[PDB]
């Protein structure tokens, strides 16, 4: 009935389902999967017709489905991410093939809030604290992202290649870059992936083609400044920002997105190549992240890694700063050793 055409029966069924308890023993995989597909279809259709206010029913159901069991959690996360990125349910989030932006931000609000609800661990933990995103949910979002964007996963090793590989993978890197420019929600999901510590490593392929589409663009950018390519500047800042949030970069090296708006293209390209060099010497592998059970989060500690504070890679950055003291002098308080 959640597929039934007339809207009133559909919402009545959905609002029954959101509150109607699931069977006491369990949900059959056929039952679980049909419920999950119906729920995401209602959620997506609820939204297309009602928007953020009218999806709570489906959302409640989906969230109730997503806490059922890791099979249901992975199924709902994969289907929600895939339906978010399908040729349908893409124009609600700024997807390419004019629409109002405001509705896009708030549709994305509902989808990302659902994902955080499904992803976050249920269950006063201080009056201001926030629940911890689970690693595995973001890991599943990561693999679904990589399979949606670059399905081959030909670079499925997490350690990064030598920067000479970039010219061997030009078509694939351009594909990932084209996808990221087409579907902005992707970055949001990356941030969500980044909002959990390790899972961004499982998106490394993406990020490597992403940096190379960015690097490639900064290769051919003949404009004297950085603002003549707005989307690429924002994507590069968001990528470094997402990598620095995902703790793939050290704070001193990851802060460079702040100066990216006052730099020349080759300077930021050398900065991103220092990013690549660091990702080469260290690499996004899950074993370096340690589970602090006192707060229950995966933490990336560069100090024990050895030279994680940008021993030589900060040489390029500091050389940029000295070259640009006339404009970046005040910014120099962003990239100190402590």
């Amino acid at each position: 009935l959640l597929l039934h055409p007339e809207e009133e029966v559909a919402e009545a069924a959905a609002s029954l389902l959101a509150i109607c308890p699931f069977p006491s023993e369990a949900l059959s995989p056929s039952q679980l999967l049909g419920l999950v597909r119906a729920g995401v279809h209602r959620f997506f259709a609820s939204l297309r017709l009602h928007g953020p206010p009218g999806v709570a029913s489906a959302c409640q159901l989906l969230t109730r489905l997503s806490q059922t069991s890791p099979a249901g959690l992975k199924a709902v996360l994969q289907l929600l991410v895939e339906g978010a990125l399908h040729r349908g349910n893409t124009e609600l989030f700024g997807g390419q093939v004019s629409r109002n932006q405001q509705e896009v931000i708030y549709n994305t609000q509902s989808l990302l809030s659902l994902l955080v609800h499904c992803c976050s661990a249920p269950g006063c933990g201080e009056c201001w604290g926030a629940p911890i995103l689970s690693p595995e949910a973001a890991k599943a979002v990561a693999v679904t992202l990589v399979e949606s964007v670059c399905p081959d996963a030909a670079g499925a090793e997490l350690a990064w290649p030598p920067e000479e590989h970039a010219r061997a993978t030009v078509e694939r890197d351009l594909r990932i870059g084209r996808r990221f420019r087409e579907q902005p929600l992707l970055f949001e999901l990356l941030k969500l992936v980044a909002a959990a510590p390790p899972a961004l490593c499982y998106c490394s392929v993406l990020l490597r083609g992403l940096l190379a589409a960015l690097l490639g663009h900064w290769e051919a950018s003949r404009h004297p400044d950085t603002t003549h390519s707005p989307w690429h500047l924002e994507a590069s800042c968001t990528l470094v920002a997402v990598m620095a949030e995902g703790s793939l970069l050290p704070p001193a090296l990851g802060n460079m997105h702040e100066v990216f708006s006052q730099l020349a293209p080759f300077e930021v390209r050398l900065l991103l190549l220092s990013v690549w060099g660091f990702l080469r010497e260290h690499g996004p592998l899950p074993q370096k992240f340690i589970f602090q059970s006192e707060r229950g989060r995966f933490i990336r500690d560069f100090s024990r890694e050895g030279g994680g504070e940008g021993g030589p890679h900060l040489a390029v950055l500091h050389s940029v700063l000295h070259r640009n003291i006339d404009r970046l002098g005040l910014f120099s308080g962003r990239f100190q050793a402590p």
């Binding site: 099979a71 199924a75 030909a154 499925a156």
Partner: protein, 165 residues
């Protein structure tokens, strides 16, 4: 949500010529064992006997492209059954669009050979493009090929379980 009992009931529907139900509950047990085929289905659940009963059921339902792609789930690839079923021309399982689930170079070469024999130029081009993939090359250092096999296994199992449930 037990996998042994979904298997048992799939076998019971199998013996009584209820092959659609046999596929349904075989796939149910498989998706219970993994997490919707996202993980790797343990070898002790999708055993060779189960894979063979499933392949027979898919043949009797005339899903012969599914037969070719299932034949490569075994420990040893059963080229004979996939080759015979690929020779069938009455199939109900979206023959060409399902080709993305073929990771065996020999099976794709055989399919291209039939498409050349039967003159199916479009399907020939699709099969050639499937072969002409860098990750599908037989010379990959044993890791890109295994990962390709696992991801095609996952996509196949989940789209199959969608068709049956």
């Amino acid at each position: 949500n037990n996998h042994s009992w979904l298997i048992i009931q799939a076998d019971i529907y199998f013996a009584t010529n209820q092959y659609s139900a046999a596929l349904h509950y075989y796939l149910q047990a498989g998706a219970v064992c993994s997490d919707f085929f996202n993980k790797a289905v343990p070898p002790d659940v999708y055993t060779d006997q189960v894979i063979k009963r499933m392949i027979k059921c898919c043949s009797l339902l005339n899903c012969h492209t599914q037969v070719a792609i299932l034949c490569q789930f075994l420990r040893e690839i059963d080229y004979k059954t996939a080759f015979k079923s690929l020779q069938e021309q009455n199939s109900h399982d979206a023959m060409d669009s399902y080709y993305d689930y073929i990771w065996d170079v020999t099976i794709l070469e055989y399919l291209t050979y039939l498409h050349h024999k039967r003159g199916e130029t479009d399907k020939r081009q699709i099969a050639i493009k499937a072969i002409g993939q860098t990750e599908l090359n037989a010379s990959n250092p044993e890791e890109v090929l295994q990962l390709a096999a696992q991801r095609r296994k996952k996509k196949f199992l989940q789209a199959m379980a969608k068709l049956y449930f």
